[PDB]
Amino acid sequence: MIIPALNLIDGTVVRLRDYGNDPLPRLQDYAAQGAGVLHLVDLTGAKDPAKRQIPLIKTLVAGVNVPVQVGGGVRTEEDVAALLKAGVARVVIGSTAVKSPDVVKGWFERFGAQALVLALDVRIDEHGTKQVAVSGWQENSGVSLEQLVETYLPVGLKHVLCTDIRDGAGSVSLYEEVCARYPQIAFQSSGGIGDIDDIAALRGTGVRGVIVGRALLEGKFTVKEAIQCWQN
Ligand SMILES: [Cl-]
């Protein structure tokens, strides 16, 4: 599947530049073109968890007919719960999944693996290792993609979002390897989609979902075209 994505600050659609502040029409049109899943980054909430755009998220989710994954500074059990209650389908967890794996495994137990997506930023280092980092501007955290995935497999890990820190050029080698290694996990790719051929390269790799943000906002291609390409 293609997974169209928006980034939101104070209700404004942004790139990580300003793309207006009417996210709901955009999302609805994404769904209208055949999107089966959408993805939102709450950048405000990522900055300040007290400022979580819950009420906007509620309206957005209510306004489409497809599951929305939402992430952005999710730190607590109560964060997950509040997002789910607002109607989000899947909560996307990034830094906390790296920071507090035993706590997050507890979340898998409470909420179920279908409600959670682990988002891992990956740097391939000098030695060829897929290093996990909590963000593009912090150093590697000292754990490989494989090591962290295998930490969560015992609690039924199903959804992993993997960003090669590509984001915002083409995404292929990395994805072929990890998808082959863990065929029971549905990997999503993020970052590096600049043209429709970037989507093409990911066909065959075993990646299950392709996150597309910027390129849709810049009119490079449409969601419908993305889906046609992805489905071959
Ligand atoms: Cl599919």
Q: What is the DSSP string of the chain?
A: -EEEEEEEETTEEE---B--S-HHHHHHHHHHTT-S-EEEEEHHHHH-GGG--HHHHHHHHHTSSS-EEEESS--SHHHHHHHHHHT-SEEEE-HHHHH-HHHHHHHHHHH-GGGEEEEEEEEE-TTS-EEEESSTTS-EEEEEHHHHHHHHGGGT--EEEEEE--------HHHHHHHHH-TTSEEEEES---SHHHHHHHTTS---EEEE-HHHHTTSS-HHHHHHHHH-
Residue 145 C-alpha to ligand 1 middle, in angstroms? 23
Angle subtended by helix axes 145-152 and 173-181, to nearest 10: 30
- Tell me which residue of 201, 132, 200 sits closest to 172, measured CA to CA: 201
Residue 231 C-alpha to ligand 1 middle, in angstroms? 8
Q: What would the two tokens of residue 215 be?
A: 């390129």
Residue 208 C-alpha to ligand 1 middle, in angstroms? 6
Q: Tokens 């790296």 — which residue?
A: 98
Angle among Cα 63, 66, 72 to the nearest 5 degrees reads 80
Residue 76 C-alpha to ligand 1 middle, in angstroms? 30
As a whole number of angstroms, the distance between CA 58 and CA 115 comes to 16
Residue 152 C-alpha to ligand 1 middle, in angstroms? 23
As a whole number of angstroms, the distance between CA 106 and CA 108 comes to 5
* 165 CB neighbour count, 10 Å cutoff: 17
- Judge whether 202 and 191 are in contact, CB under 8 Å: no
Residue 2 C-alpha to ligand 1 middle, in angstroms? 8
* 155 CB neighbour count, 10 Å cutoff: 16
Contacts for 122 with CB less than 8 Å, ≥ 6 apart: 130, 131, 132, 133, 145, 162, 163, 164, 165, 174
- Judge whether 204 and 230 are in contact, CB under 8 Å: no
Q: 65: domain range?
A: 1-232
Residue 180 C-alpha to ligand 1 middle, in angstroms? 17
As a whole number of angstroms, the distance between CA 172 and CA 202 comes to 6
Residue 209 C-alpha to ligand 1 middle, in angstroms? 7
Q: In b/e form, how buried is each residue of 97-121, taking b as 16+ CB within 10 angstroms?
A: bbeebeebbebbeebebebbbbbbb
φ, ψ at 95 (rounded to 5°): -60, -35
φ, ψ at 130 (rounded to 5°): -80, 90
Residue 212 C-alpha to ligand 1 middle, in angstroms? 15
Residue 125 C-alpha to ligand 1 middle, in angstroms? 31
Q: What would the two tokens of residue 40 be?
A: 């939102």
Contacts for 197 with CB less than 8 Å, ≥ 6 apart: 170
Residue 78 C-alpha to ligand 1 middle, in angstroms? 31
Contacts for 221 with CB less than 8 Å, ≥ 6 apart: 195, 196, 215, 229
Which residues neighbour ligand 1 (ion) by CB within 5 Å? 1
Residue 83 C-alpha to ligand 1 middle, in angstroms? 25
Contacts for 58 with CB less than 8 Å, ≥ 6 apart: 86, 87
Method: X-ray
Domain CATH number, residue 166: 3.20.20.70
Total count of domains within the chain:
1
